[PDB]
Amino acid sequence: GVSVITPGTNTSNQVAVLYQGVNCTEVPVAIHADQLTPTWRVYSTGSNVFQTRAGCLIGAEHVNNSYECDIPIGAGICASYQTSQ
């Protein structure tokens, strides 16, 4: 499955995608070279690709802090919208 992470329509248009139960090597192979079910590929470039237990997280900067869950993701990961922003 493919799920979209957003902090709100107008809080920001910035969003992150999750390929739950996927390895962070096929989504790079899911670049615009081969057109998978998703059509957009601008974020497929990455530069912030993060691999987690739940799957592959793209477009979301990875930090090394601890906070209360904002948006559940899975396998001990929650993402929020903080600062730069």
Added chain:
Amino acid sequence: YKTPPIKDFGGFNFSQILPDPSKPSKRSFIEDLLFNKVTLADAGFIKQ
């Protein structure tokens, strides 16, 4: 809440039920038995 390092509980004993740091999974002794007893399937690991 973190348990105090000194286990002075008036003779009452909880070492087995309290976590032991040595365990890679910080689980009490009894908890480990429960994990082994359950023949879990479809763990959902990332695998590869």
